């Protein structure tokens with residue numbers, strides 16, 4: 268309801284990427300989901316997520332959760348709680364968050380819009 272950004276864990280993106288906080292169970296909004304390029308393997312999805320202050324596209328989904336995307340329960344605009352995630356740092360220094368467990372709290376259809384005015388996070 269009122270003040271929609273109050274429904275999101277403002278500051279969680281910075282906490283994850285800066286402080287190395289992996290204990291939080293932040294509530295984030297999905298802004299976009301797209302497949303990455305895969306070959307002979309299960310598909311893999313990349314997500315642009317928002318905590319209300321920042322967006323960040325450095326997220327990929329555990330493949331065990333693919334059905335959430337493919338059956339449309341996890342889609343752009345939905346609000347989700349991340350129950351478990353890990354971080355992998357690439358050779359070039361970029362960090363990637365792999366979402367291992369998450370819960371859809373509000374469906375995309377029940378939210379319907381990007382919440383707030385988040386700006387891209389600068390790693």
Ligand SMILES: O=C(O)c1cc(-c2ccc(CNC(=S)c3ccc(-c4ccc(C(=O)O)o4)cc3Cl)cc2)n(-c2ccc(Cl)c(Cl)c2)n1
Pocket residue numbers: 303304305311313324325326327328329330331355361362363364365
């Ligand atoms: O084509 C593409 O477009 C493509 C490609 C990729 C891509 C990049 C890096 C990697 C390296 N693989 C890593 S970062 C990774 C590590 C662990 C897991 C993991 C643990 C448990 C599970 C599971 O249960 O599924 O998965 C997964 C990954 Cl993917 C891979 C792809 N990227 C890419 C580029 C930059 C970023 Cl910030 C992101 Cl989110 C994705 N784009």
